[PDB]
UniProtKB/Swiss-Prot annotation, chains A, B:
The modification Phosphoserine is found at S134. Its main location: cytoplasm. Substrate binds at S142. GO terms for molecular function: 17-beta-hydroxysteroid dehydrogenase (NADP+) activity; catalytic activity; estradiol 17-beta-dehydrogenase [NAD(P)+] activity; estradiol binding; NADP binding; NADP+ binding; protein homodimerization activity; small molecule binding. InterPro entries: 17beta_DH, NAD(P)-bd_dom_sf, Sc_DH/Rdtase_CS, SDR_fam. Favors the reduction of estrogens and androgens. Converts estrone (E1) to a more potent estrogen, 17beta-estradiol (E2). Also has 20-alpha-HSD activity. Uses preferentially NADH. It catalyses: 17beta-estradiol + NAD(+) = estrone + NADH + H(+); 17beta-estradiol + NADP(+) = estrone + NADPH + H(+); testosterone + NADP(+) = androst-4-ene-3,17-dione + NADPH + H(+). The gene is HSD17B1. The keyword Phosphoprotein applies. Belongs to the short-chain dehydrogenases/reductases (SDR) family. It comes from the Eukaryota. It comes from Homo sapiens (Human). This is 17-beta-hydroxysteroid dehydrogenase type 1. It is found in: Cytoplasm. Keywords: Cytoplasm, Lipid biosynthesis, Lipid metabolism, NADP, Oxidoreductase, Phosphoprotein, Steroid biosynthesis.
Amino acid sequence: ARTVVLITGCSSGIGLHLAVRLASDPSQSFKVYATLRDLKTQGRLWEAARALACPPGSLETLQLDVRDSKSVAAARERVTEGRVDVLVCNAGLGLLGPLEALGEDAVASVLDVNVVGTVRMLQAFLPDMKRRGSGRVLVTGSVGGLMGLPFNDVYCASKFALEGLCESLAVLLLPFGVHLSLIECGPVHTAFMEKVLGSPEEVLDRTDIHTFHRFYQYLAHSKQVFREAAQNPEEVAEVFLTALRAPKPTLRYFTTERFLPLLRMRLDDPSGSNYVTAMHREVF
Amino acid sequence: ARTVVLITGCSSGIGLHLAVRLASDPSQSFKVYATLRDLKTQGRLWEAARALACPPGSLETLQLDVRDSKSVAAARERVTEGRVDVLVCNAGLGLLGPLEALGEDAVASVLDVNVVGTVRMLQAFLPDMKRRGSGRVLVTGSVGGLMGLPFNDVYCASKFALEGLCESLAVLLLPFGVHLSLIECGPVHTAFMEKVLGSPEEVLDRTDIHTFHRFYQYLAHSKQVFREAAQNPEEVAEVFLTALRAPKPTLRYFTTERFLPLLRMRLDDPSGSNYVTAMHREVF
Ligand SMILES: C[C@]12CC[C@H](O)CC1=CC[C@@H]1[C@@H]2CC[C@]2(C)C(=O)CC[C@@H]12
Ligand SMILES: C[C@]12CC[C@H](O)CC1=CC[C@@H]1[C@@H]2CC[C@]2(C)C(=O)CC[C@@H]12
């Protein structure tokens, strides 16, 4: 009927805001398929959809576990239009804490969901976009996929991974007509974000007293950055729209130019010592 | 007794050459624990060890599956000295082909071995190095972890991941005394390398005729680069030694400056369009 968009991880954050922003667009040219792991959490999405008065039939919810390829396939078929014009790979997972204190299953989960998950999506929907000779894929990144952050080893690993995966495809898709873009977000006003950060005893028993004291220092400094730089999801969700409408999209979109200074000096010295020292001071 | 080194994935390539290079060092100051997934492949290592006349007791082989944490633990205990001074995380896995043609288990395997595997190693040996206040960790990288390469989506994903994981730890380890370094290798004279590349029908039935024709073009161009830039493992294995002896090691060591030009222009334009076009031409 009109631009068919499918978004993953819509139970909150960028995903939820992006879905309603699309569905409630005045032009009414978007049909949105919001995906969620557990449906019992679709409440907030629907409540937000009523707040913005989304016309009936512009928003549909599907249960989709990106950790499972059978659920990825079952979903693709629930797509009545029989076509996907815009795939937004947003499902993500975070992990904070010193490496040694992280469980093995947790580390495997973050990579399975964040990296293998978007690969599974790309596999089930990419072929068709190549046949057509047209398609758009949006992947939500982070500045943590452009530079390493202490205590975010595995999170950064998964996001750094997305940069490599996407940068590789882009080289090959250029002549196929389907465009791929990464949306590099900095912190994004998530009240829950600054509440997850705060793990005293549980962490303290799996690490030494000096790593723990540094963790505290990281938490302290991060909550300061969050409160002084976090942007509104509407500002971020609108960058996706800018990427979505560019006639010839670039590979990377930055929601903010704030962290660009730090990224520069990391590209100025390929050996990485300047960045490692610079970043160590702005956190310790 | 003397610098205790433990290396992973020693059945061939960098791993095997590095192990004997260490063990057979004239100073005799290195005790080497070469690790392998399957012991039935330790032949080449021993044969190479005799060729360089490694003194008895300077080289020991251990079976270690980095895909399993119980095997990682059992190994750490087989370390008689009760200490590891240099951990070299070398176990790696490659994957070539268009995304849609790759199996799901294969993609999961490459990340489990390449990324989660080195995380498991870091978890079992990092704490002790922090207690001591001294330690050295060497991780073998690739230029494919610094820039995306067509048809190497998942391989680059895993190597890009190592850059993020390591860059993150380095920020936190700086004041602990344990150093971490990545050894960025370009192609390395592996006869088997240019033989793996060559998948006609099997690939052709899981992808379209235009992606397949491009694959052929990639294979063709890559074998040209391999034959005109691949370096000797002794040249590469010696970079590890340079990193190992620097009083204050940097975070990144490049075995060659050849691919540095391309890396520069990728750091000159953060949006990534210049790189994507530049790389598309030098391969198509
Ligand atoms: C590392 C950095 C940015 C640099 C600051 O000094 C510390 C910091 C805290 C929280 C991080 C953020 C980068 C963007 C992150 C990763 C998100 O994507 C959520 C909270 C975020
Ligand atoms: C992408 C690139 C380097 C750029 C060339 O145009 C194409 C090419 C072929 C083989 C790749 C290599 C980078 C280094 C790699 C990844 C290895 O690590 C083994 C063979 C290698």
